[PDB]
Amino acid sequence: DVLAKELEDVNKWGLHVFRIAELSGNRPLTVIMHTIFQERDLLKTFKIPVDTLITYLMTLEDHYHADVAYHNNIHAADVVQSTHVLLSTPALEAVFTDLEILAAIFASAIHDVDHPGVSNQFLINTNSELALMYNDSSVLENHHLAVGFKLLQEENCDIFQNLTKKQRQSLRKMVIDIVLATDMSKHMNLLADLKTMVETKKVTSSGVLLLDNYSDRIQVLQNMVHCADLSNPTKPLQLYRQWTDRIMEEFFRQGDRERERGMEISPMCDKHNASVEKSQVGFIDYIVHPLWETWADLVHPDAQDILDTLEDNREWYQSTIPQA
Amino acid sequence: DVLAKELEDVNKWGLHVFRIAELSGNRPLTVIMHTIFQERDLLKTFKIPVDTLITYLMTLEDHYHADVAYHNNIHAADVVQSTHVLLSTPALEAVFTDLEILAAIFASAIHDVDHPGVSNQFLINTNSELALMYNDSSVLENHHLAVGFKLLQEENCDIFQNLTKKQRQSLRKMVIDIVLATDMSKHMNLLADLKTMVETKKVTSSGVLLLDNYSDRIQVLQNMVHCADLSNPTKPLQLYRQWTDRIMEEFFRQGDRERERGMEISPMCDKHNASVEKSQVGFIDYIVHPLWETWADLVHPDAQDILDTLEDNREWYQSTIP
Numbered sequence: 311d312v313l314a315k316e317l318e319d320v321n322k323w324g325l326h327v328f329r330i331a332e333l334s335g336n337r338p339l340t341v342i343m344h345t346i347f348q349e350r351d352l353l354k355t356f357k358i359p360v361d362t363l364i365t366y367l368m369t370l371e372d373h374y375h376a377d378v379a380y381h382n383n384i385h386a387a388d389v390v391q392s393t394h395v396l397l398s399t400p401a402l403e404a405v406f407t408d409l410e411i412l413a414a415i416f417a418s419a420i421h422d423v424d425h426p427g428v429s430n431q432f433l434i435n436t437n438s439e440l441a442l443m444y445n446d447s448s449v450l451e452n453h454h455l456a457v458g459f460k461l462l463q464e465e466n467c468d469i470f471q472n473l474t475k476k477q478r479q480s481l482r483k484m485v486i487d488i489v490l491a492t493d494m495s496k497h498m499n500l501l502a503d504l505k506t507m508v509e510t511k512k513v514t515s516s517g518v519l520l521l522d523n524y525s526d527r528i529q530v531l532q533n534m535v536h537c538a539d540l541s542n543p544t545k546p547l548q549l550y551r552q553w554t555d556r557i558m559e560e561f562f563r564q565g566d567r568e569r570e571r572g573m574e575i576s577p578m579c580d581k582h583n584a585s586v587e588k589s590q591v592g593f594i595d596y597i598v599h600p601l602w603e604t605w606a607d608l609v610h611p612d613a614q615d616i617l618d619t620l621e622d623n624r625e626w627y628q629s630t631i632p633q634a
Numbered sequence: 635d636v637l638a639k640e641l642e643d644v645n646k647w648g649l650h651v652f653r654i655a656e657l658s659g660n661r662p663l664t665v666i667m668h669t670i671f672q673e674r675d676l677l678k679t680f681k682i683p684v685d686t687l688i689t690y691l692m693t694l695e696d697h698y699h700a701d702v703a704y705h706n707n708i709h710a711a712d713v714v715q716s717t718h719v720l721l722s723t724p725a726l727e728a729v730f731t732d733l734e735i736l737a738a739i740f741a742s743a744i745h746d747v748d749h750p751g752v753s754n755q756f757l758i759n760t761n762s763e764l765a766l767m768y769n770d771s772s773v774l775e776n777h778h779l780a781v782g783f784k785l786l787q788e789e790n791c792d793i794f795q796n797l798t799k800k801q802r803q804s805l806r807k808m809v810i811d812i813v814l815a816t817d818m819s820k821h822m823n824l825l826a827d828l829k830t831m832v833e834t835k836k837v838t839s840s841g842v843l844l845l846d847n848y849s850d851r852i853q854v855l856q857n858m859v860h861c862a863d864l865s866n867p868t869k870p871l872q873l874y875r876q877w878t879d880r881i882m883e884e885f886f887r888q889g890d891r892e893r894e895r896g897m898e899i900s901p902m903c904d905k906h907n908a909s910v911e912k913s914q915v916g917f918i919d920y921i922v923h924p925l926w927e928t929w930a931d932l933v934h935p936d937a938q939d940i941l942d943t944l945e946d947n948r949e950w951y952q953s954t955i956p
């Protein structure tokens with residue numbers, strides 16, 4: 311129906327994921343993941359029973375919280391789909407193995423599962439059980455990973471059942487390395503290293519990147535998924551505006567819990583003293599554009615249009631802020 | 635009490651900790667920790683109620699497994715006491731704050747709590763719940779921390795209740811930094827950095843280390859507790875012999891579990907093909923001597939006798955290779 315028609319844009323940047331969410335009965339992660347696994351022939355390549363894949367995806371999607379405004383199953387589906395597009399960038403053609411592709415997409419699907427809608431710093435400062443378990447270090451990202459893997463143990467949920475032991479071990483390592491890289495406290499280090507990789511990058515006459523060790527290979531997949539995680543401001547403005555609404559709702563709810571506890575309210579979490587426009591422009595200026603500019607450098611000219619959208623959206627958000 | 639007479643050596647390298655374990659009714663960790671907290675006046679400084687201290691220590695000690703041959707409450711007591719002695723080394727006089735001292739001692743006390751008697755790699759290889767929880771990274775060390783901190787929440791167990799909020803935050807951070815550094819996968823990087831500090835060593839007139847910032851202070855504490863953790867071969871030989879018997883018993887049990895599951899048996903875990911003496915010599919040559927020689931350099935000449943004992947103990951095991 312209408313859903314099958316929308317899913318024809320699955321290989322395009324700016325898939326209307328909110329429409330897909332509505333039309334699928336709030337199963338955007340399941341349908342988009344299923345569509346992408348079919349597209350990349352992943353079920354055949356790894357002997358994944360289709361009923362198994364769907365059971366896992368539905369269980370995974372169930373462990374994203376419906377009452378969390380941003381970090382929910384729609385965000386997960388969005389990051390999966392964005393990673394799916396980035397994987398197909400010309401500069402990376404025939405670079406990654408099918409296992410590495412599977413790792414990147416699976417990592418994207420689980421990378422925020424069971425997110426409580428508050429930040430790592432909130433969990434640390436409120437002495438949460440999660441921060442106690444994980445010794446204040448990548449608290450949520452460690453938990454996403456544990457939950458994501460733990461769900462494979464559900465009945466008929468092991469989508470990796472027909473991988474070799476070696477394949478399982480390699481995939482597990484890559485997925486962990488990738489999801490831990492979505493911790494924003496690692497952003498500046500990831501970016502500094504990505505800049506150095508760009509400075510010294512090797513290609514082939516065909517034109518694709520040369521990555522001849524695990525460290526360079528995982529580094530590209532880490533930044534790729536990190537870019538997809540931070541890809542909202544690079545999307546068509548109608549989509550970006552909705553993401554912005556959701557993240558602010560989530561932040562303000564955290565701010566209200568902080569205010570209730572007599573805590574200092576985190577930056578951008580006070581509904582009474584926050585400029586959405588100023589905050590998006592700062593977010594783009596200091597985080598999203600410096601990253602995407604570097605990714606665009608790596609894969610030049612593949613990401614030119616993405617970078618243009620980002621720059622147009624930045625100019626749009628700053629346009630109503632009075633300036634000298 | 636006879637216990638009191640043995641605890642007179644609490645400030646010496648080579649305290650007989652096994653004797654303390656027996657005399658105390660297998661509470662070496664509680665009594666040694668109590669003795670050190672009293673000696674360092676830490677109850678007064680941090681307003682720790684003595685009943686709260688004893689209750690936390692008894693609870694902590696109960697969560698070391700009595701059926702684990704090496705990684706049990708006696709090893710915890712040993713590392714606490716060894717750290718206590720290292721903190722008193724002349725080259726470190728007045729270097730650390732009481733909070734830093736408290737962190738090093740507390741970290742040493744909890745650093746192996748709830749150890750199951752198998753390695754990180756074994757937990758990863760067997761797809762344990764713990765390796766799943768911690769994503770195969772510093773699995774046990776993350777667990778030791780979680781448990782040591784969680785136990786503060788038991789009834790009348792919060793020994794840090796009267797620290798300020800910022801003190802609690804600072805101590806929490808240092809303790810995590812220290813216990814995570816006991817992960818042996820970090821040994822080579824830890825040692826390399828220690829060598830760098832030795833190379834750029836700053837001291838006063840009297841040879842007291844000059845540490846400039848948190849990076850300096852935590853690195854010295856991390857290496858100190860790592861040295862204490864690896865101090866068995868630097869102890870009086872009779873102690874060292876018993877530690878060797880215990881670590882082999884624990885390793886052999888892990889090997890038995892591996893053999894039963896058809897797994898490759900881990901290095902030095904096969905009781906059917908062990909060379910205990912030769913493995914101690916290799917352990918000293920490749921890990922323990924390089925570490926302690928570097929520590930000895932840092933605090934020169936404070937650790938000379940410890941290094942001499944290590945070298946003598948190496949020759950003992952050399953001389954007993956069949």
Ligand SMILES: COc1ccc(C2=NO[C@@H](CC(=O)N(CCO)CCO)C2)cc1OC1CCCC1
Pocket residue numbers: 428429430431450492493494540542543550553554557558578589590593
């Ligand atoms: C559509 O706009 C955004 C889309 C995504 C983000 C993210 N920023 O950080 C990531 C979450 C994270 O890892 N955190 C923040 C706690 O969730 C770090 C601790 O866990 C996601 C931010 C966005 O803008 C925010 C609104 C005002 C500017 C900032």
Ligand SMILES: COc1ccc(C2=NO[C@@H](CC(=O)N(CCO)CCO)C2)cc1OC1CCCC1
Pocket residue numbers: 752753754755774816817818864866867877878881882902913914917
């Ligand atoms: C008295 O002898 C020893 C005293 C202490 C050790 C240690 N070795 O490393 C630490 C344990 C560790 O962190 N492991 C190994 C599993 O506990 C790795 C965690 O997954 C403590 C070893 C000793 O000797 C071994 C016996 C053959 C030579 C080596």
Ligand SMILES: [Mg+2]
Pocket residue numbers: 421422450492
């Ligand atoms: Mg996240």
Ligand SMILES: [Mg+2]
Pocket residue numbers: 642643
């Ligand atoms: Mg005496």
Ligand SMILES: [Mg+2]
Pocket residue numbers: 745746774816817
């Ligand atoms: Mg340990």
Ligand SMILES: [Mg+2]
Pocket residue numbers: 836844845846847850
């Ligand atoms: Mg210095």
Ligand SMILES: [Zn+2]
Pocket residue numbers: 385389421422492539
């Ligand atoms: Zn995310």
Ligand SMILES: [Zn+2]
Pocket residue numbers: 709713745746816863
């Ligand atoms: Zn230990």
